[PDB]
Amino acid sequence: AKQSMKAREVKRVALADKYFAKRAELKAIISDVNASDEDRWNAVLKLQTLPRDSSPSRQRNRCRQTGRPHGFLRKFGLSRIKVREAAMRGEIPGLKKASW
Amino acid sequence: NQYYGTGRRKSSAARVFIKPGNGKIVINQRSLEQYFGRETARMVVRQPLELVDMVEKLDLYITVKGGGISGQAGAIRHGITRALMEYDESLRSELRKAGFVTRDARQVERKKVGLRKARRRPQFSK
Amino acid sequence: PRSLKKGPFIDLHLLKKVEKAVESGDKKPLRTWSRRSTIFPNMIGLTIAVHNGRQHVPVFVTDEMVGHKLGEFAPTRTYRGH
Amino acid sequence: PRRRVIGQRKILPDPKFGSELLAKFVNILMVDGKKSTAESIVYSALETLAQRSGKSELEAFEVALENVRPTVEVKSRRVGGSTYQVPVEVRPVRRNALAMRWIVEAARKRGDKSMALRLANELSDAAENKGTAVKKREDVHRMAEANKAFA
Amino acid sequence: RIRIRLKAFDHRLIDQATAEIVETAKRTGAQVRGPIPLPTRKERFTVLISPHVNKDARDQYEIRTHLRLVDIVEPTEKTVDALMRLDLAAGVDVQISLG
Amino acid sequence: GQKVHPNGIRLGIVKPWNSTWFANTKEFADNLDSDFKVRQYLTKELAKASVSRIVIERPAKSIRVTIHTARPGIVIGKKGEDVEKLRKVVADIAGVPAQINIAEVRKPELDAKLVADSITSQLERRVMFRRAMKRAVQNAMRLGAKGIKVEVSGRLGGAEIARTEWYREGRVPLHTLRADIDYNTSEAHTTYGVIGVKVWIFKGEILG
RNA sequence: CGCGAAGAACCUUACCUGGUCUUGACAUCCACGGAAGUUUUCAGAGAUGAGAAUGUGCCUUCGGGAACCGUGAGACAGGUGCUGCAUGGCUGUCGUCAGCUCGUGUUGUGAAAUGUUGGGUUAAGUCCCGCAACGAGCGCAACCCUUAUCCUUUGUUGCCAGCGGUCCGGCCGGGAACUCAAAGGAGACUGCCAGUGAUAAACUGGAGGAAGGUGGGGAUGACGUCAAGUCAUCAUGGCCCUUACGACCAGGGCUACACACGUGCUACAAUGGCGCAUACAAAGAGAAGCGACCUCGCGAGAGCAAGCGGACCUCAUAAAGUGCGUCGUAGUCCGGAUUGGAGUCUGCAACUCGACUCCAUGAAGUCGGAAUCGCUAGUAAUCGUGGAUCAGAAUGCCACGGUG
Ligand SMILES: [Mg+2]
Ligand SMILES: [Mg+2]
Ligand SMILES: [Mg+2]
Ligand SMILES: [Mg+2]
Ligand SMILES: [Mg+2]
Ligand SMILES: [Mg+2]
Ligand SMILES: [Mg+2]
Ligand SMILES: [Mg+2]
Ligand SMILES: [Mg+2]
Ligand SMILES: [Mg+2]
Ligand SMILES: [Mg+2]
Ligand SMILES: [Mg+2]
Ligand SMILES: [Mg+2]
Ligand SMILES: [Mg+2]
Ligand SMILES: [Mg+2]
Ligand SMILES: [Mg+2]
Ligand SMILES: [Mg+2]
Ligand SMILES: [Mg+2]
Ligand SMILES: [Mg+2]
Ligand SMILES: [Mg+2]
Ligand SMILES: [Mg+2]
Ligand SMILES: [Mg+2]
Ligand SMILES: [Mg+2]
Ligand SMILES: [Mg+2]
Ligand SMILES: [Mg+2]
Ligand SMILES: [Mg+2]
Ligand SMILES: [Mg+2]
Ligand SMILES: [Mg+2]
Ligand SMILES: [Mg+2]
Ligand SMILES: [Mg+2]
Ligand SMILES: [Mg+2]
Ligand SMILES: [Mg+2]
Ligand SMILES: [Mg+2]
Ligand SMILES: [Mg+2]
Ligand SMILES: [Mg+2]
Known part of the structure; x- marks a missing residue:
């Protein structure tokens, strides 16, 4: 994509994987059962003050080479066209063109 | 002493065992009426035992796995028509004349790209 | 609707602001760019102004509104008729 | 097709009786491949007819299909600057193929409560030429007789 | 007993890699249980080709992970040691498993 | 665009792969960037070299980069520098103990990447493409390669309407699967655009 | 025209209104003070300013450099901004149609022709025979993957024909037979008997075979054409911008609606609704994941915690069908649209805008005008299940089987 979007993604992943201690120790208190009903109201006001980008929902898988956001594949890591250009040259192992 | 067959219809694999006897029909430890619904399936499961005159003389043990309700009927038909060729072998010319030795090489045909079924196109405008 | 057992949603920057603004009383219209808060019962009788996409629109909030969220009195895109 | 002259394919016989005539007739009653309910409806109506006529179950069918086989029919030519119909005779297979199709095209237009009754009525009527x-x-x-001047 | 998995992508490279294990166990001792052909997962993928607008043009690729498995019944000390002496060519994965 | 890339229709029939490692789904993602980051730096660095084909290979968390090249003395140089200096950066990028080789490409008039890079350097230095293609076909034909097609495309000779050209010789059946077809392309970035080059070299039919 | 988009609430996002920044959000070079640092208050919608607890892995002729960091001058950065009629690469089409051409030779003043035409034949410029033609190349066929029967080899997590225990569950001693899982091979060639043939090329029947004439499907798309399609995947030649066409943030927007067209799903019912019992599949997927057993809930689902990098464990129950009821041609116990009340889950957050379950509501529609669409055998027609993209979200897309 543009040259800023990949910088935005490598700025987002750092925060979202840095604050991974607190957002499994706020959702525990929120989505528990026997906990305090007046601490379950402060552990829901902390969750809107941990910074907004620090969230493992707020990032689309960019391509590992171009930066194209659509048409991903998870297993290779490359987009719809840059999997074709490698698999029709030979750089991805065992990836023969299928027919049956 | 017993004789053996193996047949394959659409997506089934029958397995038939023949002994001389009175006529018992056992399929997955079930009697022949307990398994099958329709009288054409009870026809086609019996058909080559009627074709030669060998209903009464022999009992048989049958196991079948995987397929549909016609698959586990044509499979047993091909199984018995194999397994009777290891009984007297001059049954073969008349089973071949009757058209029971040929395994049907039909099978489900795959779905290609841009075809909403195996051969159905989508619709068309101008 | 939300799951109930998380409780209702409200931003901190509007919750603390509204508990200050009740205890300072002024009906100078309180503006906000947070149109996703469940209106609370101690917000009865206030003049807030929610963003709509262009500007604030003023909302005087009564007893009747307190179930809903602050968006449903800011209609978003203008429409007049063809 | 243009080139390949091809063969009329085989068929299973009927389940119950033993006639390869009924093999087409159980097929033409069918929608969406469910041949079992087609095998059931027909073997109910071919007992209700076999009771209402007082004839045998196989023999109440042919002498009601006799009254709906045609003998000749038309097709269309337009050789010159004019559409002609042409009365051609009909083939011994398409004879029965038309006969068993008209009856089922008719028997989805009655007003009764069941397909068995809609076919028993439709066979008794064509057994009494109405x-x-x-x-x-x-x-x-x-x-044909309105076009025997064409041939 | 001691079982070893073998995973690969190519069945002219899994068979030498398993014959060089059967002819290691049967040269330090005995009682191997052969290779047993497990199922073969074929991970298909289907992508478009054209860079802008052609939904009716596709390439279809597959990846066919070949499995094998080999048991070892009565292990000596040199029987277990001359196996962990052995490495294998790239493409083949192993995972030793006592029982 | 109507023809399949004639390497990748033969990727199991004759031609073998250019990376032979193995990992499961959790590492197959990362290996296709730790492969491309070590092909990109080498294709940058040894650009002056005659490099044709880099084959990577991972036995037991350790890389093994084979370079195919045809000027091995301008990648090694004095007694002990260039490949052993490349070891410490390939090990940094791949994060494993690096291991580099060198493979001599005998007869560099036939290795299909090398004729392509020869022509795409000639069209950087502005020679007549009509002479360059015929020189390439002549040198690859008398060396013993049973057939060759060369094709250039786009902005040829500085023109303002683009077109292609192509020269055959011998026999080049792309529909016959079991041939030894060698195919590669290249892209000269001149002062007028990008002038693409495709080659095709038939070294012989190959049984199996 | 269910097309890029294999999945827009924020993100994506390119657009809008606001608030803000200008060697920059993103790099190398420095001018160069100064180790990075989990934490933490005020103000702000947030952007980010104001504020609180710190240093030694190198190690230095200590007028300076190493992964990390602030400020100002710069050189370049940056553009999803125009040009697909300047281009590369990649694709759709005529078309899976059997055609497109060259080398010598001869004839023609010459453009060009002969070959490639003609009589037979094939799915085919396929093959034979004749000919100022002789030979060859890309194509039209074959090599390749899958499906169809047999023979070896290796037998667990797969299997149980004959053995003995058996909780009548291949479960448990066992067995290598068999289905099956996969490696290597055997097999089909117009090869064989007859007949029409121009003695040849073939073709028509039938014998053996599991398969008959290309056994059934796929993969492969010649020379080229419409200046076909994208500069918005990426790279690019020139051009335009540089307190903006660059860059960060919150909230809106792509989802509006008087209407028209294209593609699909569900129906208009008895071959069918509803309620109870009852059998038979295939192909896939899974560690921030698939999550069985057990309990609470009318139900979506929360509760507890085994099992599994998987022929072991899960998702997982197949539905059409078969049997016994009920129903009786009605806007119907048909059909589920639209609206109200109450809830569950992922998620910072379901108001514009999420799927799902329960209680209500029960519209339009009785087979559809001119005109048009798909299909030649496991095919069309109906029935269910899985996957990719994905935190949640497809009636489309891609796959496999069941009836036929
Ligand atoms: Mg997302
Ligand atoms: Mg139209
Ligand atoms: Mg269209
Ligand atoms: Mg046809
Ligand atoms: Mg489509
Ligand atoms: Mg194509
Ligand atoms: Mg958004
Ligand atoms: Mg164009
Ligand atoms: Mg182009
Ligand atoms: Mg355009
Ligand atoms: Mg123009
Ligand atoms: Mg000539
Ligand atoms: Mg002359
Ligand atoms: Mg021609
Ligand atoms: Mg000519
Ligand atoms: Mg001819
Ligand atoms: Mg030819
Ligand atoms: Mg071919
Ligand atoms: Mg015959
Ligand atoms: Mg024959
Ligand atoms: Mg155009
Ligand atoms: Mg554009
Ligand atoms: Mg770029
Ligand atoms: Mg935004
Ligand atoms: Mg849209
Ligand atoms: Mg309309
Ligand atoms: Mg009912
Ligand atoms: Mg999943
Ligand atoms: Mg419960
Ligand atoms: Mg209802
Ligand atoms: Mg309700
Ligand atoms: Mg009405
Ligand atoms: Mg009616
Ligand atoms: Mg999903
Ligand atoms: Mg189907």
């Missing part, structure tokens, strides 16, 4: 089957047969069979 009904929406033999009236269609009269139309087809009369468009």
Whole structure:
């Protein structure tokens, strides 16, 4: 994509994987059962003050080479066209063109 | 002493065992009426035992796995028509004349790209 | 609707602001760019102004509104008729 | 097709009786591949007819199909600057193929409560030369004599 | 007993890699249980080709992970040691498993 | 665009792969960037070299980069520098103990990447493409390669309407699967655009 | 025209209104003070300013450099901004149609022709025979993957024909037979008997075979054409911008609606609704994941915690069908649209805008005008299940089987 979007993604992943201690120790208190009903109201006001980008929902898988956001594949890591250009040259192992 | 067959219809694999006897029909430890619904399936499961005159003389043990309700009927038909060729072998010319030795090489045909079924196109405008 | 057992949603920057603004009383219209808060019962009788996409629109909030969220009195895109 | 002259394919016999005539007739009653309910409806109505006529179960069918086989029919040519119909004779297979199709096209137009009854009525009527089957047969069979000047 | 998995992508490279294990166990001792052919997962993928607008043009690729498995019944000390002496060519994965 | 890339229709029939490692789904993602980051730096660095084909290979968390090249003395140089200096950066990028080789490409008039890079350097230095293609076909034909097609495309000779050209010789059946077809392309970035080059070299039919 | 988009609430996002920044959000070079640092208050919608607890892995002729960091001058950065009629690469089409051409030779003043035409034949410029033609190349066929029967080899997590225990569950001693899982092979060639043939090329029947004439499907798309399609995947030649066409943030927007067209799903019912019992599949997927057993809930689902990098464990129950009821041609116990009340889950957050379950509501529609669409055998027609993209979200897309 543009040259800023990949910088935005490598700025987002750092925060979202840095604050991974607190957002499994706020959702525990929120989505528990026997906990305090007046601490379950402060552990829901902390969750809107941990910074907004620090969230493992707020990032689309960019391509590992171009930066194209659509048409991903998870297993290779490359987009719809840059999997074709490698698999029709030979750089991805065992990836023969299928027919049956 | 017993004789053996193996047949394959659409997506089934029958397995038939023949002994001389009175006529018992056992399929997955079930009697022949307990398994099958329709009288054409009870026809086609019996058909080559009627074709030669060998209903009464022999009992048989049958196991079948995987397929549909016609698959586990044509499979047993091909199984018995194999397994009777290891009984007297001059049954073969008349089973071949009757058209029971040929395994049907039909099978489900795959779905290609841009075809909403195996051969159905989508619709068309101008 | 939300799951109930998380409780209702409200931003901190509007919750603390509204508990200050009740205890300072002024009906100078309180503006906000947070149109996703469940209106609370101690917000009865206030003049807030929610963003709509262009500007604030003023909302005087009564007893009747307190179930809903602050968006449903800011209609978003203008429409007049063809 | 243009080139390959091809063969009329085989068929299973009927389950119950033993006639390869009924193999087409259980097939033409069918929608969406469910041949079992087609095997059931027909073997109910071919007992209700076999009771209402007082004839045998196999023999109440052929002598009601006799009244709906045609003998000649028309096709269309336009050789010169003019559409002609042409009365051609009909083939011994397409004879029965038309006969068993008109009856089932008629028997989805009655007002009864069941398909068995809708086919038992439609076979008794065409066993007594009345009904929406033999009236269609009269139309087809009369468009030959209305066009025997064409050949 | 001691079982070893073998995973690969190519069945002219899994068979030498398993014959060089059967002819290691049967050269330090005995009682191997052969290779047993497990199922073969074929991970298909289907992508478009054209860079902008052609939904009716596709390439279809597959990846066919070949499995094998080999048991070892009565292990000596040199029987277990001359196996962990052995490495294999790239493409083949192993995972030793006592029982 | 109507023809399949004639390497990748033969990727199991004759031609073998250019990376032979193995990992499961959790590492197959990362290996296709730790492969491309070590092909990109080498294709940058040894650009002056005659490099044709880099084959990577991972036995037991350790890389093994084979370079195919035809000027091995301008990648090694004095007694002990260039490949052993490349070891410490390939090990940094791949994060494993690096291991580099060198493979001599005998007869560099036939290795299909090398004729392509020869022509795409010639069209950087502005020679007549009509002479360059015929020189390439002549040198690859008398060396013993049973057939060759060369094709250039786009902005040829500085023109303002683009077109292609192509020269055959011998026999080049792309529909016959079991041939030894060698195919590669290249892209000269001149002062007028990008002038693409495709080659095709038939070294012989190959049984199996 | 269910097309890029294999999945827009924020993100994506390119657009809008606001608030803000200008060697920059993103790099190398420095001018160069100064180790990075989990934490933490005020103000702000947030952007980010104001504020609180710190240093030694190198190690230095200590007028300076190493992964990390602030400020100002710069050189370049940056553009999803125009040009697909300047281009590369990649694709759709005529078309899976059997055609497109060259080398010598001869004839023609010459453009060009002969070959490639003609009589037979094939799915085919396929093959034979004749000919100022002789030979060859890309194509039209074959090599390749899958499906169809047999023979070896290796037998667990797969299997149980004959053995003995058996909780009548291949479960448990066992067995290598068999289905099956996969490696290597055997097999089909117009090869064989007859007949029409121009003695040849073939073709028509039938014998053996599991398969008959290309056994059934796929993969492969010649020379080229419409200046076909994208500069918005990426790279690019020139051009335009540089307190903006660059860059960060919150909230809106792509989802509006008087209407028209294209593609699909569900129906208009008895071959069918509803309620109870009852059998038979295939192909896939899974560690921030698939999550069985057990309990609470009318139900979506929360509760507890085994099992599994998987022929072991899960998702997982197949539905059409078969049997016994009920129903009786009605806007119907048909059909589920639209609206109200109450809830569950992922998620910072379901108001514009999420799927799902329960209680209500029960519209339009009785087979559809001119005109048009798909299909030649496991095919069309109906029935269910899985996957990719994905935190949640497809009636489309891609796959496999069941009836036929
Ligand atoms: Mg997302
Ligand atoms: Mg139209
Ligand atoms: Mg269209
Ligand atoms: Mg046809
Ligand atoms: Mg489509
Ligand atoms: Mg194509
Ligand atoms: Mg958004
Ligand atoms: Mg164009
Ligand atoms: Mg182009
Ligand atoms: Mg355009
Ligand atoms: Mg123009
Ligand atoms: Mg000539
Ligand atoms: Mg002359
Ligand atoms: Mg021609
Ligand atoms: Mg000519
Ligand atoms: Mg001819
Ligand atoms: Mg030819
Ligand atoms: Mg071919
Ligand atoms: Mg014959
Ligand atoms: Mg024959
Ligand atoms: Mg155009
Ligand atoms: Mg554009
Ligand atoms: Mg770029
Ligand atoms: Mg935004
Ligand atoms: Mg849209
Ligand atoms: Mg309309
Ligand atoms: Mg009912
Ligand atoms: Mg999943
Ligand atoms: Mg419960
Ligand atoms: Mg209802
Ligand atoms: Mg309700
Ligand atoms: Mg009405
Ligand atoms: Mg009616
Ligand atoms: Mg999903
Ligand atoms: Mg189907």
